[PDB]
Amino acid sequence: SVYDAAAQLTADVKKDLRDSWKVIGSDKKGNGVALMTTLFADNQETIGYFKRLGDVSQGMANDKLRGHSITLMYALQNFIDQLDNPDDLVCVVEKFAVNHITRKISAAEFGKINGPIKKVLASKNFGDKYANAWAKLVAVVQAAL
Amino acid sequence: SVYDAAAQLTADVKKDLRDSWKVIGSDKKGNGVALMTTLFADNQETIGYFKRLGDVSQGMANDKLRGHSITLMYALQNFIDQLDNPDDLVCVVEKFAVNHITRKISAAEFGKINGPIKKVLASKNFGDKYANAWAKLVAVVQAAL
Ligand code: HEM
Ligand code: HEM
Ligand SMILES: ClCc1ccccc1
Ligand SMILES: ClCc1ccccc1
């Protein structure tokens, strides 16, 4: 279950998540747009899903993409803040899962975000250990998809 | 005009928003659910829109309502963090406006949240001064609906 995937996030994993988020989450606009542009660059097949955002190749200049990207970072802020209470983490994860289920995003497709996360983490010198930690948090969402 | 509405957030208004948010934003789960339960209690005609959440009279005990309420508080956190840059504030406000336009929520009905906000603020010893400041931020969203 989602609870099982969440309840498994250990003290060490939570530490790495919080330490990396302190840095990446400090610039939500910059890193949020970077995450999305990287997703579109490495997984061009996902571009069609974001038709509401217009021309995503516009990057930062695209107000709709910017608004979406900043908001996405607060979804992650939400997750990070709920780490010590699995019950709260689960209910917020399920809420966001619905937002993606309605768009027909499968657990496998959601996992495509791991590549971009790893790259942005590397841009701030956070290695594989950190990418693995984030993959575990992403896996909690996947349990709900 | 969302841009003219954003221009109404003067130095004094921004300060009041930040000062009150420091207190109420410190307990997103508690105050978020309080805001929702108050909305449903004083404006029963809006409950129909929240069909997905199930039995909202259960309050904190309802997992979907709790997840929704916590997330709503991060939408407000987002707005507060964008106060320095009107261009970014506008793009995130328009993003959330779409979430409500799709639910058939008009500017007039969105405005029904002002009552609950004033009541919750009052219970924390924040008077009309603060309620009016928040009404100005809510007005920015209304301009986009
Ligand atoms: C860290 C992972 C991710 C997070 C935290 C996240 C967060 C969000 C948020 C907060 C929204 C707005 C929901 C709404 O207002 O309805 C959104 C929308 C969306 N997401 Fe994600 N997302 C993630 C990964 C993905 C991935 C990998 C895909 C696709 C392969 C995806 C596809 C979508 C689509 C299509 C939308 C709708 C965009 C629109 O039309 O506004 N998401 N996401
Ligand atoms: C401070 C004011 C408000 C804020 C910041 C706010 C924020 C939000 C957020 C973040 C969501 C989730 C969006 C999504 O995932 O699609 C949401 C959903 C929703 N909001 Fe609001 N909202 C506010 C006031 C209102 C009011 C006054 C109404 C109705 C009179 C309203 C009706 C809805 C409805 C029907 C949903 C969909 C719930 C669901 O089915 O999951 N909102 N709101
Ligand atoms: Cl700190 C992990 C991360 C989150 C969002 C974007 C890029 C990296
Ligand atoms: Cl600080 C303005 C506020 C936000 C949420 C609930 C009550 C008041």
Class of domain B1-145 (CATH, top level) = mainly alpha
Residue B92 and residue B77 in contact, taking contact as beta carbons nearer than 8 Å? no
Residue A130 and residue A83 in contact, taking contact as beta carbons nearer than 8 Å? no
- C-alpha gyration radius of chain B: 15
- CB within 8 Å: A67 and B95: yes
Residue A29 and residue A62 in contact, taking contact as beta carbons nearer than 8 Å? no
Q: Is A104 left (phi over 0), alpha (psi -120 to 50) or beta?
A: left
A127 alpha carbon to ligand 2 midpoint, in Å? Answer: 38
- CB within 8 Å: A74 and B70: no
Residue B32 and residue B69 in contact, taking contact as beta carbons nearer than 8 Å? yes
In terms of CA atoms, which chain A residue is nearest residue B95? A67
Cα–Cα distance measured from residue A138 to residue A24, given in angstroms and rounded to the nearest whole number: 16
Q: How many residues does chain B have?
A: 145
* Shortest alpha-carbon distance between residue B71 and chain A (Å): 7
Tell me the one-letter amino acid at B15.
K
Cα–Cα distance measured from residue A33 to residue A50, given in angstroms and rounded to the nearest whole number: 14
Return the residue matching tokens 């809510």: B138
Residue B144 and residue B99 in contact, taking contact as beta carbons nearer than 8 Å? no
Q: At A56, list the tokens.
A: 């995503």
What are φ and ψ of residue B54, in 5° steps?
A: 80, -140
Q: At B38, list the tokens.
A: 């108050």
Q: Residue by residue, what is the 3-state secondary structure of A9-25?
A: CCHHHHHHHHHHHHHHC
Sequence ranges of the domains in chain A = 1-145
Which of A68, A77, A94 is opposite residue B67, by nearest beta carbon?
A94
Tell me the one-letter amino acid at A33.
V
Question: Residue whose CA is closest, atom 8 of ligand 4?
Answer: B117
Torsion sign across C-alpha atoms A51, A52, A55, A60: negative
